Design a protein around this ligand. Structure first.
Ligand SMILES: [Zn+2]
Length: 239
């Protein structure tokens, strides 16, 4: 099969946040997160992207493959799930590390012994809606999509000490200061790649109830929205 990736240090997986459903923004070391937008990170149109799955049960691995390929109904892009070589997208299932993917072709800047995507909370009992939501969302990032997030009406009620502890773990290794600029300041304003915000978007950024004092952390958006479908077709046209 595939060559083993280097393992996540288990000391850097933060205890107590098992099951906390956090999608983490991630970028190749030293790059500017503001530059990682779909017009810059999109794959060559018509690409067939090789994907490798590392670990996971056969059931979870089948679910990843099932829902990742939903994007190809609308985008002129195909995922080829392979078991040899160095795949372009490398998916791990490290429990407790959150879920994340590098954006678009930024995956190609990741060392070949490291993962480019992680699913941190799936198990064999996970619901179909949660598989659909999280897998389509993360492969959205893999196509270059960023989070959709509308301007907060009221400041997010961050449980700041739970947050500082969580983002100190792998893979960000963020300081107190790092969280203040990259997380708090980022989501204090609108984040969007659409001309108008789409409350139904699969790319909606949900903030975990493990990281806040109140509010509803699980939105409705578990399938591609009409805007998701229309936009991804303009990025990757059948041309
Ligand atoms: Zn995300």
């Amino acid at each position: 099969g595939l060559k083993e990736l280097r393992a996540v240090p288990k000391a850097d997986i933060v205890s107590g946040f098992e099951g906390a459903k956090v999608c983490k923004d991630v970028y190749p070391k030293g790059t500017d997160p503001r530059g990682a937008v779909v017009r810059s990170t999109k794959w060559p149109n018509g690409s067939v992207i090789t994907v490798g799955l590392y670990g996971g049960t056969p059931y979870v691995r089948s679910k990843v493959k099932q829902y990742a390929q939903e994007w190809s109904n609308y985008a002129n892009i195909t995922f080829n799930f392979v078991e040899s070589g160095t795949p372009q997208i490398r998916v791990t299932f490290t429990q407790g590390a959150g879920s994340y993917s590098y954006l678009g072709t930024q995956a190609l800047s990741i060392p070949s012994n490291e993962e480019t995507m992680n699913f941190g909370w799936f198990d064999d009992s996970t619901s179909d809606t949660e598989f659909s939501r999280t897998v389509i969302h993360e492969f959205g990032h893999a196509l270059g999509m960023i989070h959709e997030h509308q301007h907060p009406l009221t400041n997010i009620p961050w449980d700041k000490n739970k947050v500082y502890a969580y983002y100190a773990g792998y893979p960000n290794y963020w300081s107190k200061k790092d969280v203040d600029n990259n997380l708090f300041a980022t989501y204090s304003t609108t984040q969007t790649q659409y001309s108008a915000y789409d409350t139904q978007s699969i790319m909606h950024y949900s903030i975990s109830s493990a990281l806040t004092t109140n509010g509803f952390s699980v939105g409705n958006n578990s399938v591609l929205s009409a805007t998701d479908k229309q936009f991804i077709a303009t990025v990757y046209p059948r041309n």
